[PDB]
Design a protein around this ligand. Sequence first.
Ligand SMILES: Nc1ncnc2c1ncn2[C@@H]1O[C@H](COP(=O)(O)OP(=O)(O)O)[C@@H](O)[C@H]1O
Lengths: 134, 304, 159
Amino acid sequence: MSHEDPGNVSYSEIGGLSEQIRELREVIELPLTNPELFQRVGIIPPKGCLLYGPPGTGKTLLARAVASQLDCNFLKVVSSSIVDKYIGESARLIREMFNYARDHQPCIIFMDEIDAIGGRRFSEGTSADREIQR
Amino acid sequence: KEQNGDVKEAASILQELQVETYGSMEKKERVEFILEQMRLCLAVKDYIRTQIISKKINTKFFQEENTEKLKLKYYNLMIQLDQHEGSYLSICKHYRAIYDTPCIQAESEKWQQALKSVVLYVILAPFDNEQSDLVHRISGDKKLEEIPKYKDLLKLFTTMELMRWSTLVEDYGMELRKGSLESPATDVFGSTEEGEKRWKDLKNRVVEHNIRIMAKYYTRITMKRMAQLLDLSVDESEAFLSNLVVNKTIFAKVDRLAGIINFQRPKDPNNLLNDWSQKLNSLMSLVNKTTHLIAKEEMIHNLQ
Amino acid sequence: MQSGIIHAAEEKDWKTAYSYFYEAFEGYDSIDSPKAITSLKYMLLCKIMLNTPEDVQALVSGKLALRYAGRQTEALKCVAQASKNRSLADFEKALTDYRAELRDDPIISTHLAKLYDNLLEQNLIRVIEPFSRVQIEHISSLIKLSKADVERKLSQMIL
Ligand SMILES: Nc1ncnc2c1ncn2[C@@H]1O[C@H](COP(=O)(O)OP(=O)(O)O)[C@@H](O)[C@H]1O
């Protein structure tokens, strides 16, 4: 999920949501390119962003264009291939993900379709639910 | 500048000072603007803010190399902040800082008065190792001989002894008023309020100077011989020793119902026997070891 | 405010009560001048009585105190300075000079007598330090006071 994605046209290809196009730029591209202004006003930049809407609004496509800029410092995740057959062995993957992302300083993590791993909560359902929730 | 400012008009700039420290600081513009207001603070008779805002100054050096007329030349206005209290050691390094500008601008008249200026108060600073070594660095100067009175000032350096303040004024009464440059000596004694303070400071320098060597070379000392070797009332000697022992820079014990006083320290027999063992070990066995080896070399050099 | 008042009424905790005065003044901040103006006297009174004098001049040197400067904070300046210098005569001088400004304590008897009796040996620690074998009339001179109560006082010291 590091050296895997092929290239892509820039966001010039997509259109119709340029408000959002610029809007993600302030949370991702700007705070690393020019962190000075955040210090001048004295306010920490945002941390995480969510994308939602009907299917085929170009949600995956926009992330494709964004990752098409760096192409080297971008991690992508289906949020479904994380499960396994063992008891642990899945959280640890998350650990080393955040540890590699700790290794490289300007890391971008992408996770599609959290609803697989997302969930909300359960009143003591099945044990596999407990593996997931952990 | 239109109204020429006042307390308030000078207070106007006070709110927009740190602005372009965050906007952007330029080594030839932001410096001149950032030093500009603190003089107006000086006109306001405010120093607590002047030193704080000035703390951004002494981090904005390393452009004096290209800035001649301004960078090293506001410091003259910085001894107005350094000058309010008795920070006589603070300006010590200062006048060496400004000592170069009349040397880069190699003139040797304003530079000349820089020589006397930097030195006329190093005696006027309380004693520190920073004084004892800085007097060494100012010592051995290739231009220090330009001031022939620097040696008469050098008498105050080591083992002081007979540096009687009366003879001092007898040798120094014309460096205050007379002279060729005479301006730092004017700041020392010319101005009545400043000069007077430095008369008393000089006294301070004198008595405190002698007291140290007294502790250096006196087991005990009679009260009368102290009052006479200081030329002042025994009560005044009580003041000088009291405010110096509360200073605890020189320990003493004025046993006053007999007057005889000591400059020494008690002796734990652990300490006494420790030192006896010290001399017995170090300077009895080691040098003994060395002497035999030089003696062995003597055979090799002379007859086999 | 009256939390710090009665919490300081028995003289057991001279820190948390100070926190009550600081809290009450912060509440009176910029909304009640007559009530906020009185908090400083009690906060700095509890600090000087706490024997931490320099932070009084520090607090009054704070920009918040500049909003509420006046004859009372000036009266606390000289008192904190005399306490700092350990002067039986400077303290008496400020006490006499700003007496009307000084009377405002609800209990000026204990608050002045206790700090004073502190000031006695506060004086003695300096005025006795530089010597070992003294004749007592001179130290009665330097203290500027009779020597009998000096004998009982210092005797209280060694005791
Ligand atoms: N504005 C657009 N321009 C070009 N293609 C688009 C646009 N919007 C949507 N698409 C197409 O729709 C797909 C969006 O899929 P995706 O972002 O994964 O949505 P979902 O996650 O809901 O399936 C892309 O493969 C893309 O080809």
